[PDB]
C-alpha cells in the first residue's frame, strides 16, 4: 500500500517481525555520542540488540552516524549482517549555497550504506555519494535522501527507524516514538499486527 504508514512506539520493544521484509532500511539512531543528551539516547548494547536482521533478506541499509558512532555504527552494521559498501555525506549549506569533533568545524553529516544478501533489480550508479542541501530543523535529515533511495530501488517496500513526523513518505513505514498513533494500510501488515497486538498496546 503505496501511501505513508507509521507506528508510534519504542523501537526497542516492538515486534518488528510483523512488518515483513524490506528492500531498504533507514535508521537515524539517537546514539550515545559523547554525553550532552537533549533527547533520549540508546545505549550501545541496545543498539546492537536491535532486531535489524529480521527486516531484510536482500537489500540496503542506510545508517546515519556521528561522532564515535562512525565506529560503533560500523560495528552494528557488521553485527546485523551487512557489508558497508558506500558512505553518503551531506554537505550542509544555507540559501546562498555556502557551507554552515573538537578539532575541526563540521560541515557534513555521514550516512553509511550497507548491503545484505544478493539484492537484484536495483539501479546502482544513478546518484553520487554527496548530498548538498540546506539545513532545516535541528536533527533534521534532508529529503534528497528519499529521492536517492527511490531512484535506487523504485516501488519497493521501505522502512525508517527513529523517524520523526515530517519523515513519513509514500512507500515507507516510519517507526518513531514521536509519531501520531498507528497508521497501517497494507493488509498483510494489519493482519499480523492484530494477531500479535490484539489489544493495541506494545
Amino acid at each position: 500500500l503505496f501511501p505513508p504508514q507509521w507506528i508510534c512506539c519504542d523501537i526497542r520493544y516492538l515486534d518488528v517481525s510483523i512488518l515483513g521484509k524490506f528492500a531498504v532500511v533507514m535508521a537515524d539512531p539517537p546514539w550515545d555520542i559523547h554525553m550532552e543528551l537533549p533527547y533520549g539516547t540508546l545505549t550501545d548494547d541496545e543498539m546492537r540488540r536491535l532486531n535489524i536482521p529480521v527486516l531484510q533478506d536482500d537489500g540496503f541499509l542506510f545508517l546515519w552516524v556521528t561522532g564515535r558512532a562512525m565506529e560503533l555504527g560500523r560495528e552494528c552494521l557488521n553485527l546485523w549482517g551487512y557489508e558497508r559498501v558506500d558512505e553518503i555525506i551531506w554537505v550542509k549549506t544555507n540559501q546562498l549555497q555556502r557551507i554552515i569533533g573538537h578539532w575541526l568545524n563540521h560541515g557534513k553529516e555521514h550516512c553509511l550504506v550497507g548491503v545484505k544478501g544478493n539484492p537484484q533489480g536495483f539501479n546502482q550508479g544513478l546518484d553520487c555519494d554527496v548530498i548538498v542541501a540546506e539545513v532545516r530543523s535541528t536533527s533534521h535529515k534532508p529529503d534528497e535522501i528519499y529521492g536517492m533511495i527511490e531512484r535506487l530501488s523504485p516501488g519497493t517496500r521501505k522502512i525508517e527507524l527513529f523517524g520523526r513526523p515530517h519523515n513519513v513518505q509514500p512507500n515507507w513505514i516510519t517507526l518513531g516514538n514521536q509519531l501520531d498513533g498507528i497508521h497501517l494500510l497494507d493488509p498483510d501488515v494489519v493482519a499480523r499486527f492484530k494477531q500479535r497486538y490484539p489489544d493495541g498496546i506494545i
Binding site: 565506529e71 573538537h102 575541526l104 555519494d129 534528497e144
Partner: protein, 235 residues
C-alpha cells in the same frame, strides 16, 4: 541537486566558495628546511626514521587511485607506524572511498590512535559533466585523522584531477599545519612534487635524498623541543 545530477553536475559543483595570516607567517618562520629520503618502504626498516614524529601524513598508493607498485590494505596494515609515532602524536591517513574507509580505521586502532576527525575531499566535475560493490557514484576521498595520548572545516572542495593524477589537495597540509601539533612532521609515500618546508618526506619515487638523522634531530634539540610550529622561534 541530486535529481539535477541524475545533467552530470555533481551536487558539489554548486557550492559557493581577518588574521589567520599571522599564524601562516609564524608557521613559515618555524618550519624546518624540507628534508626528504627515497626509500622502498615495503623493504625499509621504518625504525631508522628518528626522532619520534609529532605528525604522520600517510598517503599509500591504493589500487583504486589507478582506475585507468600498488599497496594493498594488507601491506599498509603491516607498517610499524607505532614504532615511530611520538607518545602524543597525530596521524592523517588517506583512505580512498572503498574498503579503506573500514580498513584504515583498523589501521588507526592497530597503531594506537583513536579517530577524532573524518576529513572529506569532495571533488567537483565543473570541467567535465564504478566499483562492483558501489551503490553510488563515488566523488570524494576521505583522510582520517587520529590522535594518541593526551579555524578549518572538515571539507576540501577542488576539481577532480585528470585521470591518473594521484596528487592530494595541498590543502591537507594547510589544515594540518594550522592545528599546531608539533614540528616533527613525516609524509610517507610523498613524492618530489610534495616536498615542503617543515616536513620530512619518505617515499620510493623521490629522485634525491638529503636525509640525515643527526642533522634532522638537530632542528629539535633544546630550546626547540616542544615548539608547536605556531610560535615565535626561540632566540
Amino acid at each position: 541537486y541530486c535529481q539535477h545530477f541524475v545533467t552530470g553536475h555533481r551536487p558539489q559543483n554548486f557550492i559557493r566558495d581577518e588574521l589567520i595570516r599571522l599564524k601562516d607567517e609564524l608557521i613559515a618562520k618555524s618550519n624546518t628546511p624540507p628534508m626528504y629520503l627515497q626509500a622502498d618502504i615495503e623493504a625499509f626498516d621504518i625504525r631508522e626514521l628518528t626522532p619520534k614524529f609529532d605528525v604522520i601524513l600517510l598517503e599509500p598508493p591504493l589500487e583504486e587511485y589507478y582506475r585507468e607498485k600498488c599497496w594493498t590494505w594488507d601491506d599498509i596494515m603491516k607498517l610499524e607506524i607505532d614504532e615511530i609515532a611520538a607518545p602524543r602524536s597525530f596521524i592523517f591517513l588517506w583512505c580512498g572511498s572503498g574498503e579503506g574507509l573500514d580498513l584504515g580505521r583498523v589501521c588507526l586502532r592497530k597503531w594506537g590512535y583513536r579517530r577524532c576527525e573524518d576529513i572529506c575531499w569532495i571533488k567537483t566535475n565543473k570541467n567535465n559533466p564504478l566499483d562492483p560493490k558501489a551503490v553510488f557514484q563515488r566523488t570524494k576521498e576521505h583522510c582520517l585523522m587520529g590522535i594518541k595520548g593526551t579555524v578549518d572545516i572538515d571539507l576540501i572542495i577542488t576539481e577532480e584531477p585528470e585521470i591518473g593524477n594521484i596528487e592530494k589537495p595541498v590543502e591537507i597540509f594547510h589544515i594540518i599545519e594550522h592545528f599546531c601539533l608539533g614540528r616533527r612532521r613525516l609524509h610517507l609515500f610523498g613524492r618530489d612534487s610534495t616536498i615542503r618546508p617543515g616536513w620530512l618526506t619518505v617515499g620510493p619515487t623521490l629522485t634525491n635524498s638529503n636525509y640525515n638523522a643527526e642533522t634532522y634531530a638537530s632542528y629539535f634539540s633544546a630550546p626547540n623541543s616542544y615548539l608547536t610550529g605556531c610560535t615565535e622561534e626561540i632566540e
